[PDB]
Amino acid sequence: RSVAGGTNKSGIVRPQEIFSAKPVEAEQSSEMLLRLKNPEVETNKTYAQEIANSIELITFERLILQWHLLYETYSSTKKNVMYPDFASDVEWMTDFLENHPLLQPPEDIANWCIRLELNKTTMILKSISLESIINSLRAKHPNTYIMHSVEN
Amino acid sequence: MKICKACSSCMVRTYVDGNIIFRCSCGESVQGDSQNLLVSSKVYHTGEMEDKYKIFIKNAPFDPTNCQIKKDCPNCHLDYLTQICIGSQKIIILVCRCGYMSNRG
Amino acid sequence: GQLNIKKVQTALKASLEFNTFYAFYESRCPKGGLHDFQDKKCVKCGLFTYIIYDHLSQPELVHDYYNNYKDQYDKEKMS
Ligand SMILES: [Zn+2]
Ligand SMILES: [Zn+2]
Numbered sequence: 477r478s479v480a481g482g483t484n485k486s487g488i489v490r491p492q493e494i495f496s497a498k499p500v501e502a503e504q505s506s507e508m509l510l511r512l513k514n515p516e517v518e519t520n521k522t523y524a525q526e527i528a529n530s531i532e533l534i535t536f537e538r539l540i541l542q543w544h545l546l547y548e549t550y551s552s553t554k555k556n557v558m559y560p561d562f563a564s565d566v567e568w569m570t571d572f573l574e575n576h577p578l579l580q581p582p583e584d585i586a587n588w589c590i591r592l593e594l595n596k597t598t599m600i601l602k603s604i605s606l607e608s609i610i611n612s613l614r615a616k617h618p619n620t621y622i623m624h625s626v627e628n
Numbered sequence: 629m630k631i632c633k634a635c636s637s638c639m640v641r642t643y644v645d646g647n648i649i650f651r652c653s654c655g656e657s658v659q660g661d662s663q664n665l666l667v668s669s670k671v672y673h674t675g676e677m678e679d680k681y682k683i684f685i686k687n688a689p690f691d692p693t694n695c696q697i698k699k700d701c702p703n704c705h706l707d708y709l710t711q712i713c714i715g716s717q718k719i720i721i722l723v724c725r726c727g728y729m730s731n732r733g
Numbered sequence: 734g735q736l737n738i739k740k741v742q743t744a745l746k747a748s749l750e751f752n753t754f755y756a757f758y759e760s761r762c763p764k765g766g767l768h769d770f771q772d773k774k775c776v777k778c779g780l781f782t783y784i785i786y787d788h789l790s791q792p793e794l795v796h797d798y799y800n801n802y803k804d805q806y807d808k809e810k811m812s
Contacts, residue, residue: 548665719811
């Protein structure tokens with residue numbers, strides 16, 4: 477039997493989990509078996525493989541290939557003052573400012589910022605669009621303010 | 629990394645208030661402009677296959693225990709090359725004692 | 734021994750290329766974004782042409798359609 481994580485069924489690991497009543501977080505070989513709704517669509521492999529990808533957990537970290545924490549605020553295009561390497565971002569932040577006039581920079585922007593790049597291949601691979609990332613972030617994070625480039 | 633010009637000591641960062649101002653235990657301050665604003669960073673799948681194996685790749689054609697293959701070297705036309713496999717990506721590199729490096733690595 | 738090696742090799746190179754292409758695009762789409770139900774040319778042009786490999790001339794066209802994509806992704810992976 478395999479030893480690598482997620483399938484740690486080596487030796488006595490699984491028998492102790494049952495007999496010692498270890499909680500959910502202590503399980504090293506946890507599994508589930510999900511049955512596709514409806515029986516006729518359950519017979520198709522192509523429909524099976526895509527739903528499996530949809531239910532899998534995709535977090536931010538795997539969509540990013542580099543991120544940077546910067547000590548800078550934003551007061552629109554009136555004050556500037558940015559990191560030198562990333563000072564070129566205002567070329568699209570100005571595009572973002574006019575393309576998304578509904579959510580202007582708030583009146584309480586702190587002097588901090590995280591700039592993140594996306595691994596487009598992973599986005600292409602697992603079909604997360606830039607629209608879905610931004611919408612989910614803003615709904616989950618309401619003390620942060622969002623700028624993004626254009627994915628096309 | 630900021631070192632005190634007089635004490636040669638490491639200076640705290642002390643982000644107050646709209647700028648970055650380094651401070652030493654001797655009370656000296658030097659402040660910071662522009663290029664000091666990078667607080668922290670992390671780049672994924674970087675720092676691998678360039679800095680970890682540079683010495684090993686350089687010495688590989690001279691290692692007796694490295695596996696070798698029958699393949700012509702473009703530079704010195706030696707009939708054998710040194711075959712190298714690095715990483716969980718299994719990147720195959722062919723290197724020669726003449727410095728030929730297959731442009732990979 | 735009656736089988737011709739040069740025909741076997743050239744068939745395997747197409748079989749390896751097509752298998753690796755579809756193995757790489759098992760979920761991925763040449764135009765990107767999964768969509769292996771019907772959209773674009775991610776999965777099929779009708780029938781079971783994406784796995785059966787014996788209906789012929791559907792893999793010969795589709796793989797040639799996105800041969801450039803296969804070349805550019807392999808070198809990106811091999812880096
Ligand atoms: Zn000092
Ligand atoms: Zn050589």
